[PDB]
Design a protein around this motif. Sequence first.
Motif, mmCIF file in Angstrom:
data_model
loop_
_atom_site.group_PDB
_atom_site.id
_atom_site.type_symbol
_atom_site.label_atom_id
_atom_site.label_comp_id
_atom_site.label_asym_id
_atom_site.label_seq_id
_atom_site.Cartn_x
_atom_site.Cartn_y
_atom_site.Cartn_z
ATOM 1 N N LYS A 180 0.846 -1.183 0.000
ATOM 2 C CA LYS A 180 0.000 0.000 0.000
ATOM 3 C C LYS A 180 0.889 1.244 0.000
ATOM 4 N N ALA A 181 0.273 2.421 0.023
ATOM 5 C CA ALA A 181 1.026 3.647 0.229
ATOM 6 C C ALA A 181 0.853 3.989 1.699
ATOM 7 N N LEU A 182 1.930 3.839 2.464
ATOM 8 C CA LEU A 182 1.824 3.773 3.919
ATOM 9 C C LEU A 182 2.246 5.021 4.678
ATOM 10 N N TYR A 183 1.423 5.364 5.659
ATOM 11 C CA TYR A 183 1.683 6.458 6.588
ATOM 12 C C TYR A 183 2.129 7.800 6.016
ATOM 13 N N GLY A 184 1.202 8.482 5.356
ATOM 14 C CA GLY A 184 1.309 9.916 5.179
ATOM 15 C C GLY A 184 0.747 10.493 6.464
ATOM 16 N N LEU A 185 0.451 11.787 6.481
ATOM 17 C CA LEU A 185 -0.134 12.389 7.671
ATOM 18 C C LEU A 185 -1.662 12.389 7.621
ATOM 19 N N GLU A 186 -2.205 12.091 6.444
ATOM 20 C CA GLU A 186 -3.652 12.030 6.217
ATOM 21 C C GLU A 186 -4.346 13.379 6.415
ATOM 22 N N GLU A 187 -3.620 14.343 6.974
ATOM 23 C CA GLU A 187 -4.082 15.721 6.989
ATOM 24 C C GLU A 187 -3.784 16.235 5.594
ATOM 25 N N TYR A 188 -2.818 15.578 4.959
ATOM 26 C CA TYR A 188 -2.560 15.742 3.540
ATOM 27 C C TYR A 188 -3.642 14.972 2.792
ATOM 28 N N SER A 189 -4.227 15.609 1.786
ATOM 29 C CA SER A 189 -5.423 15.084 1.129
ATOM 30 C C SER A 189 -5.308 13.626 0.667
ATOM 31 N N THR A 190 -6.368 12.852 0.899
ATOM 32 C CA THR A 190 -6.443 11.471 0.422
ATOM 33 C C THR A 190 -6.431 11.423 -1.100
ATOM 34 N N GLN A 191 -7.262 12.255 -1.718
ATOM 35 C CA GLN A 191 -7.232 12.415 -3.162
ATOM 36 C C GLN A 191 -6.143 13.435 -3.464
ATOM 37 N N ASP A 192 -5.106 12.985 -4.159
ATOM 38 C CA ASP A 192 -3.909 13.792 -4.348
ATOM 39 C C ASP A 192 -2.818 12.982 -5.034
ATOM 40 N N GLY A 193 -1.808 13.689 -5.534
ATOM 41 C CA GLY A 193 -0.714 13.082 -6.269
ATOM 42 C C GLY A 193 0.403 12.346 -5.541
ATOM 43 N N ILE A 194 1.038 12.968 -4.547
ATOM 44 C CA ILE A 194 2.378 12.518 -4.129
ATOM 45 C C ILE A 194 2.552 11.338 -3.145
ATOM 46 N N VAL A 195 3.333 10.348 -3.582
ATOM 47 C CA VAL A 195 3.729 9.192 -2.768
ATOM 48 C C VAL A 195 5.134 8.719 -3.175
ATOM 49 N N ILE A 196 5.952 8.300 -2.211
ATOM 50 C CA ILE A 196 7.313 7.845 -2.528
ATOM 51 C C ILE A 196 7.398 6.384 -2.966
ATOM 52 N N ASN A 197 8.339 6.111 -3.861
ATOM 53 C CA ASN A 197 8.359 4.894 -4.668
ATOM 54 C C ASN A 197 9.076 3.675 -4.080
ATOM 55 N N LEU A 198 9.406 3.752 -2.796
ATOM 56 C CA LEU A 198 10.368 2.865 -2.148
ATOM 57 C C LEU A 198 10.305 1.383 -2.529
ATOM 58 N N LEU A 199 9.210 0.695 -2.206
ATOM 59 C CA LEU A 199 9.148 -0.754 -2.436
ATOM 60 C C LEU A 199 9.376 -1.210 -3.885
ATOM 61 N N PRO A 200 8.575 -0.701 -4.837
ATOM 62 C CA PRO A 200 8.789 -1.066 -6.243
ATOM 63 C C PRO A 200 10.241 -0.862 -6.690
ATOM 64 N N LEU A 201 10.908 0.137 -6.119
ATOM 65 C CA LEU A 201 12.306 0.423 -6.436
ATOM 66 C C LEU A 201 13.269 -0.541 -5.743
ATOM 67 N N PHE A 202 13.008 -0.825 -4.471
ATOM 68 C CA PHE A 202 13.891 -1.678 -3.684
ATOM 69 C C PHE A 202 13.732 -3.151 -4.031
ATOM 70 N N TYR A 203 12.585 -3.503 -4.602
ATOM 71 C CA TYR A 203 12.316 -4.879 -5.001
ATOM 72 C C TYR A 203 13.032 -5.200 -6.310
ATOM 73 N N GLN A 204 12.991 -4.249 -7.239
ATOM 74 C CA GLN A 204 13.621 -4.408 -8.543
ATOM 75 C C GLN A 204 15.143 -4.490 -8.427
ATOM 76 N N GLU A 205 15.698 -3.752 -7.470
ATOM 77 C CA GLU A 205 17.134 -3.780 -7.206
ATOM 78 C C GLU A 205 17.558 -5.127 -6.627
ATOM 79 N N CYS A 206 16.745 -5.666 -5.724
ATOM 80 C CA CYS A 206 17.033 -6.958 -5.112
ATOM 81 C C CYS A 206 17.081 -8.074 -6.151
ATOM 82 N N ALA A 207 15.986 -8.254 -6.881
ATOM 83 C CA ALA A 207 15.921 -9.289 -7.906
ATOM 84 C C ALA A 207 16.955 -9.038 -9.000
ATOM 85 N N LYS A 208 16.975 -7.818 -9.528
ATOM 86 C CA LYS A 208 17.922 -7.452 -10.580
ATOM 87 C C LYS A 208 18.821 -6.288 -10.161
#
Lengths: 320, 723
Positions: free
Chosen positions: B300-328
């Motif tokens: 999921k996209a985990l632990y923003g402050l939620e005072e920041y809008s639910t409908q909105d753009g920004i989230v950090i890419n950590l897992l998809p990035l760290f998973y791709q590095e591990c496998a490849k």
Amino acid sequence: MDLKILSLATDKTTDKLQEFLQTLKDDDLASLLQNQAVKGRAVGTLLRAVLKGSPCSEEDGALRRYKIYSCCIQLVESGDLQQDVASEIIGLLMLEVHHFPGPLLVDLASDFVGAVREDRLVNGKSLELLPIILTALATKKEVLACGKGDLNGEEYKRQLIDTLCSVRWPQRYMIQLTSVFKDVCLTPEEMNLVVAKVLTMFSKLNLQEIPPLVYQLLVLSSKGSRRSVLDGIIAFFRELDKQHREEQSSTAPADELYHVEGTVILHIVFAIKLDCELGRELLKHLKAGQQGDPSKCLCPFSIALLLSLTRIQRFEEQVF
Amino acid sequence: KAIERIESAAEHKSLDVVMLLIIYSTSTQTKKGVEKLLRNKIQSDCIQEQLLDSAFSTHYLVLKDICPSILLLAQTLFHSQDQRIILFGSLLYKYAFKFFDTYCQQEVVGALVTHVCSGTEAEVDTALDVLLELIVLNASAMRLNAAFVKGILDYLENMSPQQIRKIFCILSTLAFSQQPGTSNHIQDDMHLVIRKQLSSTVFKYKLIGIIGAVTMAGIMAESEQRTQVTSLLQLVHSCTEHSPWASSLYYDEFANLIQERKLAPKTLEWVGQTIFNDFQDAFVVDFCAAPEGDFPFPVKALYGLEEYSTQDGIVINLLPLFYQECAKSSLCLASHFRLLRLCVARQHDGNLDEIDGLLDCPLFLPDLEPGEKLESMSAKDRSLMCSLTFLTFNWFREVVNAFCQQTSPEMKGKVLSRLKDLVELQGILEKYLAVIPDYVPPFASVDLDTLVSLQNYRAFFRELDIEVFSILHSGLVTLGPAELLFLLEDLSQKLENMLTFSHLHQRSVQDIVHCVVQLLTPMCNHLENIHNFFQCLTAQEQHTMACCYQKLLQVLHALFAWKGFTHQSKHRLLHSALEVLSNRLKQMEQDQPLEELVSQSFSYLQNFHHSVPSFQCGLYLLRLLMALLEKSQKKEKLASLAKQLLCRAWPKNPTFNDHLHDVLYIYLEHTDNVLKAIEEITGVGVPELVSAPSSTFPTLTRHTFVIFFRVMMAELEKTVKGL
């Protein structure tokens, strides 16, 4: 053409990059001689694109890099390039010179040997590759396809170095020639050769150019053979002292010779200070012992040396 | 002998130092005798910087003929552990360089250069600290001998990250003092090695180029100036970009050069443009709660402050990035954040508004929170939950670094929650550690080290700066106890390293002391008062606040135990810290004498005792009070305080035993005739065998007895040899 190579650094490896390469083949000299002269930073990324468009997993890329490298070496030492540009060029060469196959590396370092014969380099900046070139060769113990084969990376490395000892070293660049052997790992036999050859050239230099040369020889010995480094330096001046003592009995000379010895000494006493085995090798060398020797061992210079070494705390008592 | 007697009075004058140098240089039999005496004097907290000062400033002419011995003193003083002796050995080298002949200054530089190359850990740090200060003192003379300093370069391969930074700082500072814009001995050759270092496959040798090159560029940053610096910085980014180890370093070395030196807003706005784009590119994605790709976890996209809008753009890419590095690159996230964070801050005056959404961000992560239900489901998954917890922990470790300084009260709210999320994260981190044993190398490095478990994980944290400690300004609750401790524990670990780490050590000690007086005292005075009222009036509440009580009494103590408060100048810093401890009541006089301030503070801290939860908290309070007295009845007060600690009821390990010996040592030492306190232990020492092998005025057993008797005996013997 530049921008179209900027798109290739974007999309994908191989087909994009290497296709536009095979289409040129004409000249790489006129482009780099100039596109450096407008903005030198157009060349910096020029190399990065062309080099990754010519890997060593493809011969057409490999054999192209060889021509690329050749063209990056010449200009650095030929035209007058803002050091900023000249440096960047070499930096990237040293950067990407890693994966060159056995055959090409030998060919690369052999073009330095040919340049060493007669060239006005104005830059040993070419020579900055030699250290990394030879150490790459040392990483492969398997025969390479060159000549008759039957030679490892280390042996070509050894044979390449032997050729460097045989050729004439230009009087101008021998400081940089020597400081190049400083970045390479050597065999005890290779060391005595680099040292001895450098020594062999001593009496062919104007006196005042020797003192900085000694310091360069002194920083090699740290990994190398001390006795010979000391033996040459000492005995070079010993023979040089004899000539001066003969003119005195048969001011003009005194200001140079004795000032240089004062510079040379002060260098090797500071070298012994940073490295002790060089001091212990100096004492074990000068040990009187048998009495035929102390006549042939100590001289004005080697004694001035020891007295000067008294400044260092450890060797003080041993010397006295 | 006239000098060794006065070691019983620590205030003896400067002429004693001058005379000891003369006696030292007279004969070899006086040498070894003086040498030990000088060491025992320095370990006696005597013959400090202050005295060596007035000794040299007045007497340099007298000492001009004693030089080579003074330099021989420096040596044998330099060769010991216990920096105090090494410092004084360095202060000899420096005060030599200061007023003296060239030939003398030629060897000083030489002797120091040597300590650098062939020296030990401390020897090299201290030598490079003096060699720096020498340029400050006399530059023009420093540059004349620079040929010796260059020799250091040949030994670069043996040094640390701190010193490589320290060594280039020196050489480049010399090069630019000689001439601006030109290139001379130092300039060229240090460019030479920088090239030959960057081009190595082995990271150890890239470490040298990456740090050395960013340091040069940093110093030459103060048209031809920017192009030189730029070309030097780009040559670094091209070498460092292939390995995620190197590029993170270069980003941290770049993050250093931006916060420290004051550069041109025009040079800062050049290299600043790439940073904003490069960052959004690599690490930043929109809010689609379904990330692309197959991860056998509920990502999921985990632990923003939620005072920041639910409908909105920004989230950090950590897992998809760290998973791709591990496998490849995902390891450059935190380093890039600090760099960007300092780039905007320096071009905006410190307004982070453009980035402010980054503190509101969630990350794309599987639930790390418990491993508790998921326990014993392991291998790849357990190394993944550990470092994902880890990587995130560093993110919100670096984010607290960014927004701690911000003004707005909502912005202080947004940090304070990252502080709780930083707390929960750290509990989750150690959950995976005590579970997945010993097979767990991390995916990142710390302080460059050399080439994990509970002990080590501490070191793999990122660095919080002291600005982060300004969060300490707020109060508590029935900022709670959990977050308070988290800060208080970092502080204490910092003030142990300073007054008794990279970014810390790279700002002057005085600054850190000056700030830590403001940052703490009229805060903790409010925080302490909340702890007391609480211990006057639950499982974790106790456990956590009783700890906050310690960390406070550990920190307060570390401040007044500062051994640099002996100097004249620091009196002002002391006057502040002492008068900020002066309010139980108001201040009738502004200028009140130091002596009263001492006792006003003391009394203020003396009542705190009865609230103390543990035997420890009583000790650190004693030690705190005791460090106030050293600044200037109270000797007996301390006894009763130590009496009570051994007396009232308290709720197997050397900890308890060791702290006892510390208390009984303070007890018997500060009181009246000791026979009286000794009989008490002799008369009520009997009840042990006679009751139920505890006592009235307790803590006496088989193992608690031997502790008493040692302090009992030694103190009697101390008073016996006294008369």
